[PDB]
Structure 1
Amino acid sequence: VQFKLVLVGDGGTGKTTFVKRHLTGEFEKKYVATLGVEVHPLVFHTNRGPIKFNVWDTAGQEKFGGLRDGYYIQAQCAIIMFDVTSRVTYKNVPNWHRDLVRVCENIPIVLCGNKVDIKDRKVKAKSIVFHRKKNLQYYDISAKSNYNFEKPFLWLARKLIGDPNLEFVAMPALAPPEVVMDPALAAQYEHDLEVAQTT
């Protein structure tokens, strides 16, 4: 049985494109009229059994202001997203985290910089600092290529289940990649995060 996960971040960062990679979750999503939300059931399969994240994706209302308390309430974990091609979206991460922690004081949170498939990257590893003092794990992701798609969910499942060595035994069916994540760029970016972390 299951965990509410709230996916937040500026409009246009790729939240909806990311949750939709999980094809069953997209097929089985439940639209909640009263709340302005689609709830996608993303089941994943660990070496210890299944875990279900019910991922709350907005219906775009973040473009007009903050989300209502009912969106965040009873969340057990979260993903904050920004877009590595837009510094302003990164600049706004602290405010999203504040809103989230205001309603859900002690939950595990992953920070994700999306669209790392785009060659002209504006927010690089050296610049991504917010997660350090706040105890968040960070990953680069590219929703459109499934790059690192399972990373945030695996880190969350380890935190939520209380098993640091949990692994996924099989991947969910994901929408086939719509863009190629350049494998060279992926390897440099993962190492660049490791370097920034040691600096």
Structure 2
Amino acid sequence: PQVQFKLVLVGDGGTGKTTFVKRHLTGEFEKKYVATLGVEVHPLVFHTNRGPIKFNVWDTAGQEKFGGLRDGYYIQAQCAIIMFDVTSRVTYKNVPNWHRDLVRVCENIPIVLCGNKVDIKDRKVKAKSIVFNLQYYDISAKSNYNFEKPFLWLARKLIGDPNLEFVAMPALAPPEVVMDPALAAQYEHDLEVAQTTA
């Protein structure tokens, strides 16, 4: 029928996975909870210059706070977002564990790494540490900062068009926090420098 892509969203509890996916208002409105699987599936539609794409984002019911995910949570995933908290160094050090599982259960699908809560001034995990088929982005879910970036990169990879663009932002929940334009510019530069080093 439609070109749908299963996107599994994973990462340590409290990293802001749920807050992040909920930003897309229609996807929240039209989500579906399946308790047997422990997942809320959000249909996130984005509109590219070459038409619409639909990400079916699997958000956990918080069972990562209890233990590991069932393998069937990952099954048939076509892309993924690994999420950590830039104010919590442990969430970042657990990223390889998440990556480890994804590669095991899943095919060589594209994966995006997202460091969340960059609006919080006291940042522990910075660009330098992060940069040393995978990409990284700073995001702040509470301020919609860089919200579209992970989806654009995955869309480009999945469709095989590196010149793919989004012609319009989906309806987003209004920012509950200000992303300081000065910090954002600085972080964006810190990433420019870290990229030049890579």
* TM-score when normalising by structure 2: 0.97
Q: Which residue of 1 aligns with 2:28?
A: 26
Shift of 1:197: 1.8
Q: Which runs of 4+ in 1 moved over 4 A?
A: none
Distance in structure 1 (CA, Å) of the matches to 2:116 and 2:152: 17
Whole-Å separation in 1 of the counterparts to 2:28 and 2:60: 14
Checking the alignment, whether the CA contact within 8 Å between 2:44 and 2:56 is kept in structure 1 is yes
Per-residue CA deviation, residues 93-134 of structure 1 (Å, 9 max, x unaligned), is 00000001111130000000000000100000011146xxxx
**Cα contact 2:9–2:59 (8 A) shared by 1:** yes
For residues 31-66 of structure 1, give each alpha carbon's deviation from its aligned partner in whole angstroms, at most 9, with x where no partner exists.
Answer: 112100000000000000000000000000001111
Query: Which residue of structure 1 lines up, in the alignment, with residue 105 of structure 2?
Result: 103
Q: How many residues align?
A: 195
The alignment partner of 2:36 has SS state of helix
In structure 2, distance between residues paired with 1:33 and 1:90 = 28
Alignment identity in percent?
100
Provide the aligned C-alpha RMSD in A. Answer: 0.8
> CA contact under 8 A between 2:44 and 2:57: conserved in structure 1?
yes
Distance 2:36 2:159 in 1: 31
In structure 1, distance between residues paired with 2:38 and 2:196: 42
Q: Is the 8 A contact 2:131 2:194 kept in 1?
A: no
- The alpha-carbon deviation at position 198 of structure 1 amounts to 1.6
Equivalent residues of 2:9, 2:57 under 8 A apart? yes
CA distance in 2, matches of 1:63, 1:30: 21
**Deviation for aligned residue 1:175:** 0.1
Gaps of 5+ in 1: none
What does residue 54 of structure 1 align with? 56
* Distance in 1 of aligned mates of 2:194 and 2:60: 32
